[PDB]
Amino acid sequence: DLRLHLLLNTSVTCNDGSPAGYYLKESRGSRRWLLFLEGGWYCFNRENCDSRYDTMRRLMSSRDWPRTRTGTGILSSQPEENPYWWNANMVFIPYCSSDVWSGASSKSEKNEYAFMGALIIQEVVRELLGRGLSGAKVLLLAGSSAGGTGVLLNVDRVAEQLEKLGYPAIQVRGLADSGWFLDNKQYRHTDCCAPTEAIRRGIRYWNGVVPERCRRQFQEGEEWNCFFGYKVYPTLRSPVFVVQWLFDEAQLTVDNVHQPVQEGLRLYIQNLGRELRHTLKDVPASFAPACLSHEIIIRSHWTDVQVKGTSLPRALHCWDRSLHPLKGCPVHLVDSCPWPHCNPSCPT
Ligand SMILES: O=C(O)c1cc2c(s1)-c1ccccc1CC2
Numbered sequence: 181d182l183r184l185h186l187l188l189n190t191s192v193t194c195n196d197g198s199p200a201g202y203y204l205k206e207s208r209g210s211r212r213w214l215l216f217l218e219g220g221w222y223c224f225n226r227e228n229c230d231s232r233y234d235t236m237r238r239l240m241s242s243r244d245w246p247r248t249r250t251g252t253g254i255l256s257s258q259p260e261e262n263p264y265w266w267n268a269n270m271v272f273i274p275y276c277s278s279d280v281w282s283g284a285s286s287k288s289e290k291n292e293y294a295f296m297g298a299l300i301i302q303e304v305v306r307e308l309l310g311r312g313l314s315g316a317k318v319l320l321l322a323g324s325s326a327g328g329t330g331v332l333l334n335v336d337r338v339a340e341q342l343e344k345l346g347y348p349a350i351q352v353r354g355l356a357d358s359g360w361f362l363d364n365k366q367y368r369h370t371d372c373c374a375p376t377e378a379i380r381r382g383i384r385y386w387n388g389v390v391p392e393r394c395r396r397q398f399q400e401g402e403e404w405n406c407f408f409g410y411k412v413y414p415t416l417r418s419p420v421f422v423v424q425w426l427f428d429e430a431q432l433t434v435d436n437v438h439q440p441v442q443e444g445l446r447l448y449i450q451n452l453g454r455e456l457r458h459t460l461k462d463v464p465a466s467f468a469p470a471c472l473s474h475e476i477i478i479r480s481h482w483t484d485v486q487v488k489g490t491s492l493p494r495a496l497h498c499w500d501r502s503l504h505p506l507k508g509c510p511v512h513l514v515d516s517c518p519w520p521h522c523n524p525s526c527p528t
């Protein structure tokens with residue numbers, strides 16, 4: 181079990197002004213630290229955030245959080261479930277900011293909600309240094325769905341934060357799971373939502389922040405571009421491993437894809453997997469199976485899926501070795517077959 185701590189700096193809050201926090205299980209014999217960002221979509225105006233507050237309140241508020249959480253998948257402490265990092269210090273950071281982890285905005289007389297995801301990450305890192313993170317050799321910032329996009333937006337800032345605090349020795353890395361999306365045309369048009377327009381409104385609503393080099397490329401008004409993995413990844417300096425289903429359920433949802441499939445839709449889906457494969461061609465550490473699914477790394481059976489005969493925990497161990505061209509220890513694993521479940525190890 182991972183145990184809840186609410187932030188001692190209570191100015192760093194969830195959407196409704198309640199304190200943010202983190203769940204922690206320490207490992208006294210290890211110098212590896214895993215900080216996992218939870219996902220769960222987002223909201224981009226008052227009406228849509230009010231609706232989220234009615235029926236998704238744990239993603240907006242710490243008031244009803246439980247005192248413990250069980251670690252699963254890469255957060256499990258059992259070697260059988262987590263061959264990769266079972267002996268690490270484990271941190272689960274709940275997503276209570278609805279801002280894809282990008283916001284730096286307080287609740288006030290002009291703001292009904294606080295959007296503080298970027299500051300929550302920085303504050304967790306700060307309070308953990310006093311609980312052992314100061315002795316770390318690797319800090320892996322991981323996340324799924326909106327949390328995976330959050331890794332891409334925040335990993336370089338965590339690294340800069342530790343260098344300026346006097347800890348250049350800690351190596352910061354990222355693991356981004358199911359957060360690599362395409363700003364493509366929808367299969368059938370709808371009213372807002374297309375990924376592009378939703379992010380454009382959210383950034384303004386949240387006062388969202390993006391990594392500095394990506395901001396300097398796209399410039400004022402065009403920062404939404406840095407929320408799209410294939411645009412922000414080349415600007416990053418920290419090592420980042422990318423996990424992405426070729427046919428992500430959330431990608432299909434925003435594309436309005438839901439009997440025998442007709443030619444138009446077949447071609448749309450095949451072109452979608454081809455485009456995803458193309459954006460990964462120059463990402464050296466990546467794992468991308470040809471499956472219709474969503475998230476993987478905190479699933480209890482994450483050990484089951486394979487690409488070219490190598491599982492995800494093995495690929496991540498090979499990545500570790502590469503950061504010390506390996507024989508039989510690959511790190512770039514992208515399926516080439518063109519339809520969902522052409523890979524027999526896909527989740528059922
Ligand atoms: O299921 C979740 O948590 C998320 C789903 C999506 C996210 S996050 C997103 C993050 C950046 C850019 C475009 C998108 C649209 C799809």
Ligand SMILES: *[C@@H]1O[C@H](CO)[C@@H](O)[C@H](O)[C@H]1NC(C)=O
Pocket residue numbers: 189191192299
């Ligand atoms: C609390 O967090 C806010 C927002 O990041 C920051 O400005 C302030 O310095 C913090 N206070 C302390 C005592 O750490």
